[PDB]
Amino acid sequence: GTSNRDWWPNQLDLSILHRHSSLSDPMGKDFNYAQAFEKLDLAAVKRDLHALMTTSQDWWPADFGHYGGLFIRMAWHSAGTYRTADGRGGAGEGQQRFAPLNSWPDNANLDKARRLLWPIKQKYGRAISWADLLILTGNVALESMGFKTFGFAGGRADTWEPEDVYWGSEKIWLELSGGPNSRYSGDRQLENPLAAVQMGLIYVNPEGPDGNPDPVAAARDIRDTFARMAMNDEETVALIAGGHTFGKTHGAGPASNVGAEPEAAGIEAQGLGWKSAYRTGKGADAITSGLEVTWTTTPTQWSHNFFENLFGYEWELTKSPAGAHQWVAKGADAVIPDAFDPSKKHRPTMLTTDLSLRFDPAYEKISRRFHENPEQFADAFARAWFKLTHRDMGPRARYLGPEVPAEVLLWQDPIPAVDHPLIDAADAAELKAKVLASGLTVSQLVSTAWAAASTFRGSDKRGGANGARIRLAPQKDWEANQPEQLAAVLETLEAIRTAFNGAQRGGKQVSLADLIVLAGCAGVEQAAKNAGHAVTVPFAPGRADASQEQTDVESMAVLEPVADGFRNYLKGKYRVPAEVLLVDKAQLLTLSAPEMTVLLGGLRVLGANVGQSRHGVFTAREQALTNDFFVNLLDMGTEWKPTAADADVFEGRDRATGELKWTGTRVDLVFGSHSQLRALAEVYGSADAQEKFVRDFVAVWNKVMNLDRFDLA
């Protein structure tokens, strides 16, 4: 069946803006997962998970009689798709159970792990999500094996279809670099937003870069990919050594024995894959990665044996039974237990990437410190495991249940508690009147609140207006935020705040975070008045101001917009057409196609463009809230052509006279070109639509202002 995607493979794709439809969701529209979880007997779940650890099934027998290692890998893989570039991937939506991740080569036999959890999932139902269960099971496996976790939060709601994530352009699983769709260029530079070295891997190749077993060069890939998953050197070494304190790899025979991944298998496989023709196909005969390594002398118990072995032997390159590169300890005794036969023992072995922890000079110092001070190792691993598995959960207000750690961590972008009465409706009206009497314009008010609130992304629930981080490094210096203009707006708002607060009794005060948003609202109200309409913009107080010391400047840098079509901003020239980047931004903001359309049209006419560009400002009453953008964009009296200087800028000329009327970018004109977007523009550009446009704009504005308000949720 030939599709639109076949005929027009480069056309913009809007279906990413309608994932999460209530059509695909089997739960009612009223279903609230937080409420269901808050009633779960989490202790009873943990008991059942503890019992499962040593209840082996014959269809996938447990190594050493304990599934703990398999479950820790399962949980680590669930979390470990996360990229800081866009916040996509991670454990927070339980995407491992959907395509493509359910069938990535690095997730081989994790299908079996998930199937082992079905009885517990079934027993507790909607009160524990898959997303939550995968992480909890990891935690319980650590606890069962003697490792004390830092804590656990529930609240990851299940999703019901695959997310549309760009995982790379390769058309071959695991393709080595330098191919026609290479994710690498120059001096081994991995393309943004990717955070893995080959298609279908979590981070790096365990044999070494493109299969070359050099631990020093592997270290480099490790450092790069883990950084792109938010982990520094200390966290990286704690995580790899911590994880590889447990379990084993599986490579008992050649990989050609292993069949179709889950999405390719026959219907009788009932959702599982990688069925193996090698001997029994499972347990002692299991093939997963092709490597055959067991790290420690007690694979089912926490120990300090990983670094004892790593440092205590010299290592020799060898091949697994499947042909994969790995390392064996020179002249060692057979001290490592077999997973199934008590009469067999094996020599200590390591992956190339394990040897990275010793042969990379910066890692070596941390590894040695961990070897000498195992308590520091244990604490760092517990902290990093918590971060890894919670990284995409958003503000602390979303964390549920009785095991949430009390300690506030820098990486959580923490927001101070509010400890004073909030402003009421009379106070809000007063503050808005002061904002308007100060001289701040519609365009300054709208631009500043947009800048503050539009850093939110729904992928990892970072960003937004709460915190007033727009006043701090690095947001106050971002080019998209117009630093000089921003400084002047914030100075006026700070004076308004200080005066209001000094005049109060009873300890009432307004935060700068709330005042930025409230001022934006006054600007939209003023804009509506300029167009002759009476409009009230909703506003919810309660934001607090975070400090500079609560704001990790390096972690904040990935939220910088390099493309924001809502302000007609592009920081440089890119591979990706500007309209593709607009739809990507709309997705992160959680907007539908109609919301994206109304929002952009209104922002153009309010003066939200960076640098006061005229591009797309298709109105003769700028700073008035009208549907002019749509009426003028759709006017057939105007003809459009790319400019000589720049093919991404267009001139719109009167068709009869030739006179220049407007200019726009690709972000502006795609609303007059794409057939679905132009259908949306037509609604808002019709003669009966002025009121609908205002209403719908105010709604989406308010939506964006509240994206991070999980304290109200």
**Contact region with a copy of itself (CB under 8 A), list: 204-212, 328-336, 413-421, 684-692:** 684-692
Q: Is the peptide bond before 105 cis (omega within 30 degrees of 0)?
A: no
Buried b (16+ CB within 10 A) or exposed e, 473-509: eebeebebbbeebbeebbebbeebbeebeeeeeeeeb
With respect to Na ion, which residue has the nearer C-beta, 165 or 174? Answer: 165
User: For residue 342, what are the contacts with CB-CB under 8 A and spacing of at least 6?
Assistant: none
Minimum Å distance from CB 304 to ligand HEM?
15
For 606, the 3-state DSSP assignment is: helix
58 to 97, contacts with Na ion by CB under 5 A? 87-88, 90
Minimum Å distance from CB 86 to a copy of itself?
13
Does residue number 47 form part of the binding site for a copy of itself (CB under 8 A)? no
**Phi, psi dihedrals of residue 304, rounded to the nearest 5°:** -110, 20
The interface partner of residue 306, options being ligand HEM, Na ion, Cl ion, none and the CB cut-off 5 to 8 Å by kind, is none
Whether residue 250 lies in the annotated active site: no
Does residue number 684 form part of the binding site for a copy of itself (CB under 8 A)? yes
Q: Quick one: how far is CA 517 from the chain centroid? A: 25
Q: Which residue has the tokens 């001139």?
A: 651
Q: Which residues are annotated as a binding site for heme b?
A: 244
Minimum Å distance from CB 2 to a copy of itself?
6
Does residue number 699 form part of the binding site for a copy of itself (CB under 8 A)? no
Does residue number 161 form part of the binding site for a copy of itself (CB under 8 A)? yes
Q: Which residues are annotated as a binding site?
A: 244
Indicate which single residue of 32, 47, 50, 59 sits in contact with a copy of itself (rule: CB under 8 A). Answer: 59
**Contact region with Cl ion (CB under 5 A), list: 36-44, 57-65, 161-169, 328-336:** 161-169
The interface partner of residue 392, options being Cl ion, Na ion, ligand HEM, none and the CB cut-off 5 to 8 Å by kind, is Na ion
The interface partner of residue 163, options being ligand HEM, Na ion, Cl ion, none and the CB cut-off 5 to 8 Å by kind, is Cl ion
The two structure tokens encoding residue 291: 């490597």
| Residue 39: count of CB within 10 angstroms of its CB | 9
Q: Which residues bind ligand HEM (CB under 6 A)?
A: 63, 69-70, 72-73, 76, 203-204, 206, 222, 239-240, 242-244, 246-250, 288-289, 291, 351, 353
Minimum Å distance from CB 374 to ligand HEM?
16
With respect to a copy of itself, which residue has the nearer C-beta, 112 or 358? Answer: 112
Does residue number 163 form part of the binding site for Cl ion (CB under 5 A)? yes
Does residue number 696 form part of the binding site for Na ion (CB under 5 A)? no
The interface partner of residue 247, options being ligand HEM, Na ion, a copy of itself, none and the CB cut-off 5 to 8 Å by kind, is ligand HEM
What whole-number distance in Å separates Cα of residue 603 and Cα of residue 618? 11
What whole-number distance in Å separates Cα of residue 141 and Cα of residue 163? 28
Note every long-range contact of 484-493, with CB atoms under 8 Å and residues 24 or more positions apart, other chains counting: 485/444, 485/447, 486/448, 486/451, 489/440, 489/444, 489/445, 489/447, 489/448, 490/448, 490/516, 492/438, 492/439, 492/440, 493/435, 493/448, 493/519
Q: Quick one: how far is CA 509 from the chain centroid? A: 34
For 467, the 3-state DSSP assignment is: strand
With respect to a copy of itself, which residue has the nearer C-beta, 425 or 687? Answer: 687
The two structure tokens encoding residue 303: 């120990």
Greatest pairwise CA separation for the chain in angstroms: 94
Minimum Å distance from CB 459 to Na ion?
4
The interface partner of residue 242, options being Cl ion, ligand HEM, a copy of itself, none and the CB cut-off 5 to 8 Å by kind, is ligand HEM
Check 66, 77, 250, 371 and give the catalytic one.
Answer: 77
| Contacting positions for Cl ion (CB under 5 A) | 88, 163, 165
| Contacting positions for Na ion (CB under 5 A) | 87-88, 90, 392, 459-460
Q: Which residues are catalytic?
A: 77
